[PDB]
């Protein structure tokens, strides 16, 4: 979903 | 010691706005970034949000205007405040501590599950009763294969989870053994937890995802939930034991 839960992994 | 107490009322009523706190004794809110997930009574698990390291709150696509994450970093406190409040909220509401503290990069996801808050968010009902006989209801859409299974002590059994849409290799297998918080087993598909051996095998790409249970033992018999961390971020249906008589 967001930058945040996107963290570091693609 | 690092305990995270996330505090709930038991009963609440539909309409209004509840606020899930949780204190955690022993680390700063900034570090080890905290993500709430709920259980329901008969349903299964849905992550709800997380407010990451520097400060956003990043949140589940059908409850989205719902919550609204402050937090005191002084006073060890994340308030998950929920407005407008629904008659099947009735569940184990959960916060979670991440494994890396700070630093992004190739993302380990979550040690330290709290002990579940139980709130009937209901007026009159809740889930499944009755008197005796009566209590009975679990019904999810994320397909694990097989999800209800027959194996004893010994017996090889392999997890196949296809995706709603597509995860590339982005998935942690949470093994949920009965009266516990979901336990984090392999993170990345296939990259194990420092300190399991080499014995529950998740291996796929694209779609289709496969955890063989290999040596199974009395700790084995437990519910394998897939976390899909590319599309969405959703906990899938997991697994279960019927008992025929």
């Known amino acids: 979903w967001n930058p945040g839960d996107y963290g570091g992994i693609l | 010691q690092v305990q995270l107490l996330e505090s709930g009322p038991g009963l609440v009523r539909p309409s209004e706005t509840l606020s899930l706190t949780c204190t955690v004794s022993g680390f700063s809110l900034t570090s080890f970034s905290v993500s709430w997930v709920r259980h329901p009574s008969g349903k299964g698990p849905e992550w709800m949000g997380r407010?990451?390291?520097?400060?956003?709150?990043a949140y589940n696509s059908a409850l989205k205007s719902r919550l609204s994450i402050s937090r005191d970093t002084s006073k060890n406190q994340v308030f998950l405040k929920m407005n407008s409040l629904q008659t099947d909220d009735t569940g184990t509401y959960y916060c979670?501590?991440?494994?890396?503290?700070?630093?992004?990069?190739?993302?380990?996801?979550?040690?330290?599950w709290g002990p579940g808050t139980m709130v009937t968010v209901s007026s009159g009902g809740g889930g499944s009763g009755g008197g005796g006989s009566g209590g009975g209801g679990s019904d999810i859409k994320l397909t694990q294969s097989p999800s209800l299974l027959s194996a004893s002590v010994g017996d090889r059994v392999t997890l196949s989870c296809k995706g709603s849409?597509?995860?590339?290799?982005?998935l942690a297998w949470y093994q949920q053994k009965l009266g516990e918080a979901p336990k984090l087993l392999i993170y990345?598909?296939?990259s194990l937890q420092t300190g399991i051996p080499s014995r529950f095998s998740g291996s796929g790409s694209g779609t289709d995802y496969t955890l063989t249970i290999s040596s199974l033992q009395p700790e084995d018999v437990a519910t394998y939930f897939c976390?899909?961390?590319?599309?969405?971020?959703?906990f899938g249906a997991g697994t279960k034991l019927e008992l025929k008589a």
């Open positions: 990345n598909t296939n």
């Open positions: 407010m990451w390291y520097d400060g956003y709150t």
């Open positions: 849409q597509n995860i590339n290799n982005y």
């Open positions: 979670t501590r991440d494994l890396y503290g700070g630093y992004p990069l190739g993302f380990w996801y979550f040690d330290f």
């Open positions: 976390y899909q961390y590319n599309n969405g971020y959703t």
